[PDB]
């Protein structure tokens, strides 16, 4: 198997449209119920639609009914969310989930963000390791973006052990900031190259940084 | 709409321990009909879409382990973890589907308590390439410590700074059961160009007495 895959969410301007979808395989999708549900970043999970299998009775959440419309089309396993008038309330990773006993098989989740404020992306700049061990910490600190998110790997999903990428902070600017980190064997430093793969989809800006011992 | 209340916010629970986290309803959730209480356990590990454990109050999900156990009748609902594991670190939600709308509790994050961990403490300068668009960022970074609480202050030609940094911290390891935090000084090049001495200061409770990293500007 079961996969659901949402997409369609990004920047918006409030009072704003997008529609999602929730694309379904290794199912049968008209033998089951189908769900929306949000969650504010750092906040909590917030049911906000479902529909029957036939999409013949659906419900929402007070807060979004008579802006939001569920649908389905049985025919291309495809489950949608049309989001009208959107509000600085509505930003939210919003998820899919498949009625079974519970709601089940969760997709990886959309970000919408409601705002009127500018893309921009991040620079990127080396947190170099220095001369002090058995470990070494190395970084990159990926500066002043807007909308959320970036993602960060190391050596193209290569490095994962030992990876610390923070949860992003809102400066005094309102422009986002966040450092990914690394510990590895100091030993590795003379011979093994890190480089930083960082992308803000939002803005179109992708870095490769590569983080040399000064 | 039916409110679903979890009990505690927050809960600490050491390796190979008994967590119980409870859930109420402000109406039953029977269905008379079913036989079935329509009452879903989720765990939400960090950085992870939420993953089902129960429904009907207290049928497991196939693959879930027996260590999770949902009880109650009606009202009163509750999750029992048996013999805590590093990986199950998360927010767990209760969640009513018994009438739409289909609400959630406002979830109980679970904190695994484990030995107290020193931070691992490292201090990177500003980039040149940084200081050249006329802004310097100083970063601290405490790795890998247990419990949360530290204390980091910067001194820079050790005059305390205040107002000019910003701390994050990860959630707890779903392995190592630790955090880590970035501490960021940002000064512009012109006040970074007029001092030395560079200091990230940390207070917590593994190291015998505070640990200061530091760099000298230009070296
Ligand atoms: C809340 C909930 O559990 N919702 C689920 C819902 O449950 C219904 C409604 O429950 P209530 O809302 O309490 O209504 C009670 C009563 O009707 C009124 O009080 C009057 C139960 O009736 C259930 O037993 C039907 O299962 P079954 O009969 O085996 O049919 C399966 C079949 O559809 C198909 O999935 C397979 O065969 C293919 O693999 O079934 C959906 C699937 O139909 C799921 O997607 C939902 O998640």
């Known amino acids: 198997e079961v996969q659901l895959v949402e997409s369609g969410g990004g920047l918006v301007q409030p009072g704003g449209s997008l529609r999602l979808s929730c694309s379904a395989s290794?199912?049968?999708?008209?033998?089951?119920?189908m769900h929306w549900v949000r969650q504010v970043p750092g906040k909590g999970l917030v049911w906000i639609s479902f529909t029957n299998n036939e999409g013949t009775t659906t419900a929402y959440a007070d807060s979004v009914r008579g802006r939001f419309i569920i649908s389905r089309d049985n025919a291309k396993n495809t489950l949608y969310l049309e989001m009208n008038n959107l509000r600085g309330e509505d930003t939210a990773v919003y998820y899919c989930?498949?009625?079974?006993?519970?709601?089940?098989?969760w997709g990886q989740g959309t970000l919408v963000t409601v705002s009127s404020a500018s893309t921009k992306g991040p620079s990127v700049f080396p947190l170099a390791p220095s001369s002090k061990g058995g470990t070494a910490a190395l970084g990159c600190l990926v500066k002043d973006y807007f909308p959320e998110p970036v993602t960060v790997s190391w050596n193209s999903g290569a490095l994962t052990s030992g990876v610390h990428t923070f949860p992003a902070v809102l400066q005094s600017s309102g422009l986002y900031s966040l450092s990914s980190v690394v510990t590895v064997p100091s030993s590795s430093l003379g011979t093994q190259t890190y480089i930083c793969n960082v992308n803000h989809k939002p803005s179109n800006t992708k870095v490769d940084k590569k983080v040399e011992p000064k | 709409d039916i409110q679903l209340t979890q009990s505690p916010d927050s809960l600490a629970v050491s390796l190979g321990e008994r967590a119980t986290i409870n859930c109420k309803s402000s109406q039953s959730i029977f269905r008379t009909s079913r036989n079935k209480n329509l009452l879903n356990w989720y765990q939400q590990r960090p950085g992870q879409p939420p993953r089902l454990l129960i429904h009907?109050?207290?049928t497991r999900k196939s693959g879930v382990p027996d260590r999770f156990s949902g009880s109650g009748f009606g009202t009163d609902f509750t999750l029992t973890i048996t013999s805590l594991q590093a990986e199950d670190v998360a927010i767990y939600y209760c969640?009513?589907?018994?009438?739409?709308?289909?609400?959630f509790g406002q979830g109980t994050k679970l904190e695994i308590k484990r030995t107290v961990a020193a931070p691992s403490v490292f201090i990177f300068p500003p980039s040149d390439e940084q200081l050249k668009s006329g802004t310097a960022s100083v970063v601290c970074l405490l790795n890998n410590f247990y419990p949360r609480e530290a204390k980091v202050q910067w001194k820079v030609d050790n005059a305390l700074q205040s107002g000019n940094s910003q701390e994050s911290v990860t959630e707890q390891d779903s392995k190592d059961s630790t955090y880590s935090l970035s501490s960021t000084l940002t000064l512009s090049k012109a006040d970074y160009e007029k001092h030395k001495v560079y200091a990230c200061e940390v207070t917590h409770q593994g190291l015998s007495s505070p640990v200061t990293k530091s760099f000298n500007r230009g070296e």
């Open positions: 989930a498949r009625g079974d006993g519970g709601l089940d098989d």
């Open positions: 969640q009513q589907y018994f009438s739409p709308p289909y609400t």
């Open positions: 009907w109050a207290s």
């Open positions: 290794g199912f049968s999708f008209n033998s089951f119920w």
